[PDB]
Amino acid sequence: EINARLEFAKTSTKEELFQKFKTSNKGLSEEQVEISREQYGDNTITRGKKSSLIKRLYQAFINPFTIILFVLALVSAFTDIILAAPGEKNPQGLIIITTMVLISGILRFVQETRSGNAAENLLKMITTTTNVHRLESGSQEIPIEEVLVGDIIHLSAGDMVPADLRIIQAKDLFISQASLTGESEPVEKLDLATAAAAASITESVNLAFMGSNVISGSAYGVVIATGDATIFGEMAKSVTEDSTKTTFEKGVNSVSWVLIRFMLVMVPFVLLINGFTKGDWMEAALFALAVAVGLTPEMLPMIVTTCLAKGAVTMSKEKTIIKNLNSIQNLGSMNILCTDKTGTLTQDKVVLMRHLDIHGQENIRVLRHGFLNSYYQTGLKNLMDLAIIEGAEAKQDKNPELGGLSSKYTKVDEIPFDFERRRMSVVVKSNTNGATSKTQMITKGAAEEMLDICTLVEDKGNVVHLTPELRAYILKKVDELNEEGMRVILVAQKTNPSPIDTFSVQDESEMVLMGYLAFLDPPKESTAKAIKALNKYGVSVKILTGDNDKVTRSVCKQVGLPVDKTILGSDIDQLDDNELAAVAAAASVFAKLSPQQKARIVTTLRNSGNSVGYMGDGINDAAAMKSSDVGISVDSAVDIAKESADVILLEKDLMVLEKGIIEGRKTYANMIKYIKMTASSNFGNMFSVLIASAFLPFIPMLSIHILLLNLIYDFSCTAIPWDNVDEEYLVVPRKWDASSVSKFMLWIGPTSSVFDITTYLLMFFVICPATFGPFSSLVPGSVAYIGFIALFHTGWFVESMWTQTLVIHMIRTPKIPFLQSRASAPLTILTFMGIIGLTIIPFTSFGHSIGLMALPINFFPWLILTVVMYMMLVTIFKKIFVSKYGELL
Ligand SMILES: [Mg+2]
């Protein structure tokens, strides 16, 4: 029903704009922006649903880890605050676990807010801008999201349409509406008052809709609709963006499920054993609560958030400004990099340009027409046009036949560039006249598309007829030049369109071929170093380009790329999906493709069990970028690429992409390392508790003691994001896993339980009796009894920390530590400082308040030996695990 406003804008004219038409200095636009924002709408991106925080927090607080923390608080409530004996009502754990629940839920909500699906500027690090002219200063580039009905945006070459907009000024405006309607050939728009309600909305020669990227031209226009009211909004309503890529959410939930399984197995066993043997069911509940607290690694979401933030910040610092947080996982799993040859593999700066006649000799007339075609072009200026302009300007002082053409001629019409036609045209004319007949129609483009258009040739000394022998001769010379490494463009010229109009493809015919211009794009100085690094790291660099095969093969061979059976688009059309997948999985250089052929190639490669990353900086490559699993682009590019991309790069270089991939991999490597280490250590400690529940007459450690141990360990594990990772782990694309975590827990876990039992006995027979006498003689309620219990708890507290935090330097690498794989300095410093903090805790007022005590100095050397023994046993079990289950982590 929104079509009423659109049809009203299409009909009438600028003279009937109740919502203001004149603006940018007089339009009453300083507070009407709020009226338009509320009454009309705002530029939103609402896809299928925007459930408010009322449901967002509801679904974020039912996370399995949050459920575990809540049930820990509930059991702590149901045991330590209500069902305890009278006088034994000490909450402590209730509040200290509710705080953990809240700190997990808030961080999970923050993550899910900035976690989305593929291309989404949720982080808002880098964005896309529109040249708006508001009534304060004007000419202020603003984000596309900050656009309201009743504003003017100037549309230029490459500028994506901000919102549903009505054209006000039009100068050779051509926009590609293929992103929403098809028909990749650019559609011409004009400013008029025609009504013509009978239309499929697509044409709308007066209306420019959202997503219709401007191929060429300069045009001002007023906004008539914004937000989901735009046709882009109804297209986004059909979300169809759900994917089955295992991400951080599923991995964290699976780790929580492994913890749930281990708890559901162990806690009932401990409860049954204690209740049936000791006859103290409340003590059994305390044992179960301690086991559940120890097994569950609280302060895990904080570590996950730290890892994600560190990865995002580091990737941004490595000239790789990422988008929605799931970009890290998507890019880190890239098997195939499908890029182009322009810019990525070649320094686009053309240093070898040639203006050649039909024979192959120099002739400045061709350069003159090329300069006329380039300097009077409203479209995107590529390297060829810039090289032509610079060379002509540098040589103008020598031969003034090129004498300044910027003022002696004035543009009067233009034909844009279509991939179908491969030729761009301009009709230029002298402004001062002097001949009353000068309307040249210079056209520059490809080889065969230009030859099939021209009907006569030039040079020699005459306008010779286009003999097929001449056509074959020109084509063969062009092929020779292309195989020499230089790309060539052919120019044509027609004259005397006395009515300066009717310029269609029909008028772009029957021309005189002046000659061809040759340019060389030298290969980049990164001589396959980036290519070899990507191959080492698990990325197959495939080239998707539409240029001639000869130049592409020359460049690829110069950059050490495989010059081999190169599939052309003509073959791709004949090759069905199965054989196209076969050749794509085999070939690595694809030349002379179409914007849709690249999309088909990417789709088939992805569907053949792979992940594809397309890097593009043009209007047409977005068709394949949206078809790619991870979208990559440069900052100096068109908006249709950046909006559809995910890995926007501050510089164009494959090494930047490689470093971004490495940092993204390191994020998950450190995350899974921390998860495995914490889970295995917790399993070992609680398994020692379970196996010693039948002997010790007291709980080995209080629930508050284990909780503080875990909190200190986790807050000292915040340097895991800044931890060095072995190259052997960073050279293979990897995804989230939980089975390896479970194997690590069940294998490298009990090796700590054995020495936990050793420390149990050494406390119950060597130190606590040394300070209080034999425990059997100790009477319950005495100072000696409570002192014995507190000293045992403190001893296991200190020993457990010293073993859990110092084993990180060993289990981090599957190799010999400190000999082949050193740790990170922040990790070591944080480990040492946390260990000192825990060792100093029981000697202060915090001890004897939680239940700790000062320890005898004889207790320290036993720990010095126990830690080393644990290191050795861990190394043995680590080599066993590596050689048995393939990899350690
Ligand atoms: Mg331990």
Side-chain angles (χ1 to χ4, degrees):
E1 315 288 354
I2 193 55
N3 73 320
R5 181 147 49 105
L6 308 177
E7 185 269 351
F8 163 79
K10 170 72 178 183
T11 67
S12 68
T13 176
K14 192 171 170 64
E15 319 305 319
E16 294 86 21
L17 263 295
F18 66 97
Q19 48 168 293
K20 115 194 173 178
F21 45 97
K22 173 59 198 134
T23 172
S24 171
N25 283 279
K26 176 171 50 187
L28 264 64
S29 181
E30 196 81 321
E31 295 79 12
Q32 191 186 342
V33 285
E34 285 73 32
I35 311 299
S36 293
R37 183 184 300 110
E38 287 110 40
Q39 168 194 6
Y40 297 142
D42 50 352
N43 225 17
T44 55
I45 199 59
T46 69
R47 296 288 222 85
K49 263 302 297 179
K50 281 307 178 64
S51 300
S52 179
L53 304 90
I54 310 299
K55 195 62 179 182
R56 278 182 273 177
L57 301 177
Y58 186 93
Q59 61 89 13
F61 268 91
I62 56 183
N63 171 267
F65 195 76
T66 303
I67 294 177
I68 302 173
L69 299 179
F70 154 77
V71 82
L72 294 194
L74 178 140
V75 173
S76 304
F78 284 0
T79 57
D80 300 2
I81 211 55
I82 170 66
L83 290 184
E88 311 189 30
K89 302 311 185 65
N90 170 243
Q92 290 269 262
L94 251 180
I95 303 300
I96 214 63
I97 293 181
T98 303
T99 306
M100 300 301 145
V101 177
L102 299 183
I103 209 69
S104 172
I106 295 174
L107 284 177
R108 185 141 301 271
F109 170 79
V110 173
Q111 292 173 5
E112 295 189 26
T113 300
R114 249 68 178 273
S115 83
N117 210 95
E120 262 161 327
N121 217 333
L122 299 174
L123 281 165
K124 289 292 181 297
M125 303 187 65
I126 205 67
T127 51
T128 47
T129 65
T130 72
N131 177 259
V132 86
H133 284 249
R134 296 276 175 80
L135 261 63
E136 178 187 352
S137 54
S139 178
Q140 293 296 92
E141 290 285 349
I142 60 172
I144 308 195
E145 319 86 64
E146 309 174 5
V147 170
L148 305 171
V149 180
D151 289 320
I152 50 161
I153 298 92
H154 172 237
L155 301 176
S156 67
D159 288 327
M160 179 182 175
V161 162
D164 277 4
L165 170 143
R166 147 71 195 262
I167 306 300
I168 291 307
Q169 309 294 284
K171 278 88 68 176
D172 313 319
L173 180 66
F174 284 82
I175 63 174
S176 181
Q177 308 195 277
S179 301
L180 66 159
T181 66
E183 300 185 11
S184 60
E185 187 178 19
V187 189
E188 184 180 5
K189 299 309 172 194
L190 285 170
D191 161 74
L192 265 194
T194 173
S200 298
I201 300 106
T202 67
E203 267 287 350
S204 297
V205 76
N206 184 223
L207 303 181
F209 308 95
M210 199 160 83
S212 305
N213 300 94
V214 180
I215 297 289
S216 176
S218 174
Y220 305 86
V222 291
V223 182
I224 62 180
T226 192
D228 59 328
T230 64
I231 302 95
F232 204 4
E234 68 88 21
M235 289 210 62
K237 284 199 303 179
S238 304
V239 283
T240 66
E241 212 68 22
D242 191 302
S243 180
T244 61
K245 277 191 171 300
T246 293
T247 185
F248 65 101
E249 304 151 344
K250 178 179 174 181
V252 170
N253 296 332
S254 58
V255 172
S256 300
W257 276 112
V258 174
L259 302 154
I260 277 294
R261 286 180 167 181
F262 279 176
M263 287 163 49
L264 267 290
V265 171
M266 295 174 58
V267 157
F269 198 18
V270 186
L271 176 129
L272 265 294
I273 289 179
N274 286 267
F276 273 58
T277 57
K278 182 54 187 173
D280 212 1
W281 285 92
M282 200 264 270
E283 191 181 22
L286 294 177
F287 273 106
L289 177 64
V291 169
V293 168
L295 285 179
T296 302
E298 47 269 350
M299 294 297 299
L300 158 67
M302 200 276 297
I303 299 300
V304 177
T305 307
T306 304
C307 293
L308 295 180
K310 187 263 180 182
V313 169
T314 47
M315 291 184 72
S316 179
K317 291 160 67 176
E318 311 307 312
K319 290 165 166 48
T320 301
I321 293 194
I322 74 167
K323 289 178 61 180
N324 156 49
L325 292 178
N326 301 25
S327 319
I328 294 180
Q329 174 82 345
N330 289 318
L331 168 141
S333 176
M334 194 199 313
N335 307 332
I336 309 177
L337 171 68
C338 292
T339 179
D340 200 310
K341 65 172 299 301
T342 62
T344 70
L345 299 164
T346 62
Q347 46 174 2
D348 51 358
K349 183 89 159 57
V350 173
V351 297
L352 183 53
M353 74 297 293
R354 286 165 59 168
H355 43 58
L356 305 176
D357 80 324
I358 288 168
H359 308 334
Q361 201 66 219
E362 51 190 359
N363 52 337
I364 276 191
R365 213 70 182 180
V366 172
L367 186 65
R368 185 181 192 267
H369 290 55
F371 189 28
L372 290 184
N373 198 286
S374 55
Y375 198 85
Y376 298 89
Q377 165 180 336
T378 72
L380 289 175
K381 310 94 181 180
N382 72 322
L383 47 91
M384 303 164 183
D385 306 331
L386 305 172
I388 283 299
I389 293 175
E390 270 300 324
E393 291 168 343
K395 202 147 51 193
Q396 270 175 179
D397 305 330
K398 169 170 258 57
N399 185 22
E401 183 171 337
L402 296 166
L405 313 164
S406 303
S407 61
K408 300 192 303 183
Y409 299 97
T410 298
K411 63 175 302 300
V412 83
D413 203 353
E414 183 191 30
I415 274 300
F417 156 75
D418 315 342
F419 276 86
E420 166 189 344
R421 305 178 300 103
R422 298 291 199 88
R423 47 183 178 272
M424 195 171 192
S425 309
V426 288
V427 180
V428 304
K429 57 180 301 180
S430 179
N431 187 77
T432 182
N433 291 31
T436 68
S437 59
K438 194 275 166 182
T439 46
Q440 281 195 0
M441 202 197 91
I442 302 99
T443 296
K444 53 182 283 295
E448 68 281 24
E449 285 78 30
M450 186 66 58
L451 258 299
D452 296 359
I453 283 302
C454 302
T455 324
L456 299 92
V457 312
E458 221 275 337
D459 303 321
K460 314 179 58 181
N462 209 331
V463 185
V464 184
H465 213 168
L466 187 72
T467 78
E469 196 280 334
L470 278 182
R471 175 182 301 185
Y473 167 83
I474 292 182
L475 286 182
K476 202 165 64 63
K477 191 69 207 70
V478 154
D479 288 4
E480 292 174 352
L481 288 177
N482 286 327
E483 213 160 17
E484 289 163 34
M486 305 183 308
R487 196 59 188 91
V488 293
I489 56 172
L490 274 148
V491 297
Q493 173 248 289
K494 198 173 60 181
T495 177
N496 209 328
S498 173
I500 41 185
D501 259 325
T502 66
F503 200 11
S504 299
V505 196
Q506 50 175 238
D507 284 17
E508 198 175 16
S509 300
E510 194 251 340
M511 269 179 279
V512 177
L513 186 130
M514 280 292 184
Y516 35 87
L517 296 157
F519 313 101
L520 207 168
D521 46 334
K524 269 192 171 301
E525 310 301 302
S526 303
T527 167
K529 313 285 189 176
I531 306 298
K532 282 171 169 51
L534 289 170
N535 292 132
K536 173 195 303 179
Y537 290 140
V539 180
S540 61
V541 188
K542 299 181 184 297
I543 292 89
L544 298 184
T545 183
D547 302 11
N548 200 33
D549 191 17
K550 290 153 174 285
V551 188
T552 304
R553 287 187 303 187
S554 177
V555 171
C556 289
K557 195 175 185 302
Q558 290 178 76
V559 199
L561 295 156
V563 52
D564 51 1
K565 160 194 173 65
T566 49
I567 301 296
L568 283 77
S570 176
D571 306 330
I572 292 181
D573 300 324
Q574 311 189 63
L575 301 180
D576 66 320
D577 199 313
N578 305 28
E579 189 161 358
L580 192 64
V583 299
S588 179
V589 177
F590 307 86
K592 199 168 299 181
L593 311 184
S594 82
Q596 315 307 313
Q597 279 178 342
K598 296 178 177 181
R600 186 168 202 263
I601 285 290
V602 169
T603 311
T604 52
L605 268 180
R606 168 207 285 172
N607 287 27
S608 63
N610 283 270
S611 52
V612 185
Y614 196 99
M615 181 179 177
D617 55 332
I619 313 177
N620 73 103
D621 51 53
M625 289 179 59
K626 300 185 64 177
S627 178
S628 174
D629 292 312
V630 53
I632 315 173
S633 180
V634 301
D635 203 330
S636 61
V638 299
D639 293 1
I640 194 58
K642 302 208 307 175
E643 201 83 356
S644 300
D646 223 357
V647 196
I648 295 305
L649 301 174
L650 296 187
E651 300 294 331
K652 173 173 280 188
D653 191 8
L654 307 97
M655 309 220 67
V656 171
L657 171 61
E658 161 202 351
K659 293 310 173 183
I661 302 179
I662 293 309
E663 279 284 352
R665 292 155 174 248
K666 292 182 66 175
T667 301
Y668 167 75
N670 291 331
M671 257 189 300
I672 201 65
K673 172 189 307 177
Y674 158 81
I675 289 180
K676 281 183 167 63
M677 296 183 306
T678 311
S680 64
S681 300
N682 294 17
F683 170 77
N685 295 19
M686 299 310 112
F687 189 65
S688 64
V689 165
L690 158 65
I691 200 178
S693 300
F695 307 99
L696 285 180
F698 45 79
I699 316 178
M701 265 173 56
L702 296 183
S703 299
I704 178 61
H705 297 350
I706 311 180
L707 185 139
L708 176 62
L709 178 88
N710 292 17
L711 296 193
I712 296 180
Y713 171 81
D714 282 59
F715 226 83
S716 59
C717 278
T718 67
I720 294 293
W722 290 267
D723 172 63
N724 300 15
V725 190
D726 308 327
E727 296 82 3
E728 292 75 13
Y729 203 89
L730 304 176
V731 289
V732 174
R734 197 169 288 97
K735 308 155 188 176
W736 279 75
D737 189 2
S739 57
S740 190
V741 185
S742 178
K743 290 146 48 185
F744 209 105
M745 298 179 74
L746 266 176
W747 259 89
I748 325 293
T751 173
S752 63
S753 302
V754 178
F755 301 149
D756 288 355
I757 300 173
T758 300
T759 305
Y760 282 176
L761 261 57
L762 195 144
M763 287 292 91
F764 199 68
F765 295 95
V766 188
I767 287 298
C768 302
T771 51
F772 306 110
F775 177 82
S776 301
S777 62
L778 267 47
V779 50
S782 62
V783 193
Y785 188 89
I786 309 301
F788 201 109
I789 292 188
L791 191 58
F792 197 104
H793 293 192
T794 310
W796 196 37
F797 191 55
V798 179
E799 180 263 336
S800 299
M801 171 145 188
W802 276 74
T803 53
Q804 282 184 333
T805 311
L806 287 183
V807 76
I808 302 180
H809 297 255
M810 294 280 169
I811 52 193
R812 168 184 48 85
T813 170
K815 313 181 302 178
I816 309 301
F818 300 108
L819 178 63
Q820 297 160 323
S821 175
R822 286 149 287 269
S824 187
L827 184 56
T828 308
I829 295 302
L830 200 47
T831 281
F832 283 162
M833 292 210 300
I835 288 180
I836 296 172
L838 169 138
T839 308
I840 208 178
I841 278 183
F843 296 82
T844 59
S845 59
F846 194 10
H848 317 282
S849 75
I850 53 182
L852 297 186
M853 192 188 308
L855 310 102
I857 200 173
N858 326 280
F859 166 73
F860 285 65
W862 294 117
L863 255 50
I864 302 175
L865 266 65
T866 311
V867 169
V868 178
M869 181 181 49
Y870 183 56
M871 304 287 240
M872 298 188 179
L873 199 56
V874 153
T875 303
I876 291 184
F877 275 58
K878 163 220 304 180
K879 266 229 175 175
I880 292 179
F881 194 88
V882 171
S883 290
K884 185 185 185 305
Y885 285 105
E887 198 182 30
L888 189 65
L889 308 181

